[PDB]
Design a protein around this ligand. Structure first.
Ligand SMILES: OC[C@H]1O[C@@](CO)(O[C@H]2O[C@H](CO)[C@@H](O)[C@H](O)[C@H]2O)[C@@H](O)[C@@H]1O
Ligand SMILES: OC[C@H]1O[C@@](CO)(O[C@H]2O[C@H](CO)[C@@H](O)[C@H](O)[C@H]2O)[C@@H](O)[C@@H]1O
Ligand SMILES: OC[C@H]1O[C@@](CO)(O[C@H]2O[C@H](CO)[C@@H](O)[C@H](O)[C@H]2O)[C@@H](O)[C@@H]1O
Ligand SMILES: OC[C@H]1O[C@@](CO)(O[C@H]2O[C@H](CO)[C@@H](O)[C@H](O)[C@H]2O)[C@@H](O)[C@@H]1O
Lengths: 224, 213
């Protein structure tokens, strides 16, 4: 029963603020050192700051001073990290972590880790994707193999699922990680390589599902 | 602050291999170094602290060494569960700093990417924007360079790429690059091409098409 429980993922408009919680109800709250470690997409781990509950002793990383406030509430055995004036660059997964709670020295390495809280900063609001075909052709037929796919563009937020022929085609399928575009909307492609000899006899359809906007789309992909 | 330097940035090995990762501190930190393992989409896991103290539950094959400014993490006989990214962190004083990590991947033979180029669909053009997509499929190693050219002129700033995680079956990688242009720019040029540079290619491979075929 000694775990760090974090609040759920969030979507924030630029300029807003977010407050992530981390509850540690096990053992004595004052023996934790609740630290917050950030990890932006594709980046390494970055220490933001931390606090020793009850004693309420805080330490902050220089880069976040002024923009972040880390606190702790003894009544609820919960610690918080509030990041304000959010920007696109702020998008990242925030982890709380702490040395295991001693029971009555305190070293600052992290025995315990929360599962992470994703904070996405975007000017956009919920929106279903548009699905365009990535059609096979001459420059899309390497030898006897052809590649085709679906461009799942401009949707928000994550995630979106993609299947081929309602799950009947999984071999040779590659669904890439979504990329947040300059517009604050996500985009991703799903491709599959098949025999070029099958393009005139086999039907290829990608099934896209975006629960956030209750959108479902089935796009048949055929050579141009 | 204390700057932590990890090397190599990427390590390629096979099950059964004995591997070593290093981490250097810009100044002495005694034995105050910890190591973490992290797999895609998951939170880091503590493996070692105080330089060589193995975290309860962590396999014996993991061992740490060092003090002062030089430290190492060793895996005596790599197992499939060990392929992930490792980070070192000094816990001597704040600000607490991390090394930039070492990705431990599965080694396989060099494989050139099969390249395919996709013109934007006529449907998307009606939206006022055009997306040209270039696919680099099943290659190794992961390092690759994609260069977009419009009417032989090099493109810059208008493309974004995404890469898959190493394939659990063939240990390869795949990458997609997408060039975004206004419908106006797209219908202003004829030749669209993506030039790919990779260790497995003796010279760059260029795939292209002429707008409207
Ligand atoms: O802990 C208070 C102390 O910390 C400083 C920075 O060294 O400010 C930090 O704490 C504030 C209160 O939580 C935040 O508003 C601020 O962003 C954060 O850097 C000092 O200014 C303050 O005395
Ligand atoms: O980090 C919270 C913790 O910091 C203290 C000072 O050590 O107070 C600072 O943070 C508060 C929360 O934002 C501010 O109200 C206060 O002005 C600032 O000095 C502790 O009192 C508090 O527990
Ligand atoms: O972990 C080393 C580092 O931790 C500090 C506190 O941040 O001291 C703690 O760890 C020592 C080593 O295990 C103990 O002697 C001490 O009692 C404990 O508070 C730092 O002083 C030290 O650099
Ligand atoms: O906070 C800056 C400080 O953090 C380190 C790691 O300890 O680098 C991290 O932060 C950078 C800025 O967001 C990322 O580029 C990097 O991947 C991440 O590890 C230090 O190198 C740096 O001084």
């Amino acid at each position: 029963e000694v775990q760090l429980v974090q609040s759920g993922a969030e979507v924030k408009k630029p300029g807003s603020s977010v407050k992530v919680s981390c509850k540690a109800s096990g053992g004595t709250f004052s023996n934790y050192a609740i630290n917050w470690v950030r990890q932006a997409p594709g980046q390494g781990l970055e220490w933001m700051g931390g606090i020793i509950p009850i004693f309420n002793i805080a330490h902050y990383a220089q880069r976040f001073q002024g923009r972040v406030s880390i606190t702790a509430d003894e009544s609820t055995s919960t610690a918080y990290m509030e990041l304000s004036s959010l920007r696109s660059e702020d998008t990242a997964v925030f982890y709380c972590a702490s040395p295991y709670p001693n029971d009555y020295g305190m070293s600052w390495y992290f025995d315990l880790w929360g599962r992470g809280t994703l904070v996405t900063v975007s000017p956009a609001s919920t929106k279903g994707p548009s699905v365009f075909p990535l059609a096979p052709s001459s420059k899309s037929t390497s030898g006897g193999t052809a590649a085709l796919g679906c461009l799942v563009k401009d949707y928000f937020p994550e995630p979106v699922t993609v299947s081929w022929n309602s799950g009947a085609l999984t071999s040779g399928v590659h669904t890439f990680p979504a990329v947040l575009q300059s517009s604050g909307l996500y985009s991703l492609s799903s491709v599959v390589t098949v025999p070029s000899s099958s393009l005139g006899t086999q039907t290829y359809i990608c099934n896209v599902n975006h629960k956030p906007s209750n959108t479902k789309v089935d796009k048949k992909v055929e050579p141009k | 602050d204390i700057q932590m330097t990890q090397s190599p940035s990427t390590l390629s090995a096979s099950v059964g291999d004995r591997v070593t990762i290093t981490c250097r501190a810009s100044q002495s930190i005694s034995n105050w170094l910890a190591w973490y393992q992290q797999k895609p989409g998951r939170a880091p896991k503590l493996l070692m602290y105080k330089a060589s103290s193995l975290k309860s539950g962590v396999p014996s094959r993991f061992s740490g060494s060092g003090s002062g400014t030089e430290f190492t993490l060793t895996i005596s006989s790599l197992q499939s569960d060990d392929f992930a990214t490792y980070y070192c962190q000094q816990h001597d004083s704040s600000p607490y700093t991390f090394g930039q990590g070492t990705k431990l991947e599965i080694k396989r033979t060099v494989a050139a990417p099969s390249v395919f180029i996709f013109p934007p669909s006529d449907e998307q053009l009606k939206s006022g924007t055009a997306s040209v997509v270039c696919l680099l499929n099943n290659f190794y190693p992961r390092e690759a360079k994609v260069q977009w050219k419009v009417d032989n002129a090099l493109q810059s700033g208008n493309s974004q790429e995404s890469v898959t995680e190493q394939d659990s079956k063939d240990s390869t990688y795949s990458l997609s690059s997408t060039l975004t242009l206004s419908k106006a720019d797209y219908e202003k040029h004829k030749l669209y091409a993506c030039e790919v540079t990779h260790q497995g290619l003796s010279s760059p491979v260029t795939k292209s098409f002429n707008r409207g075929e």
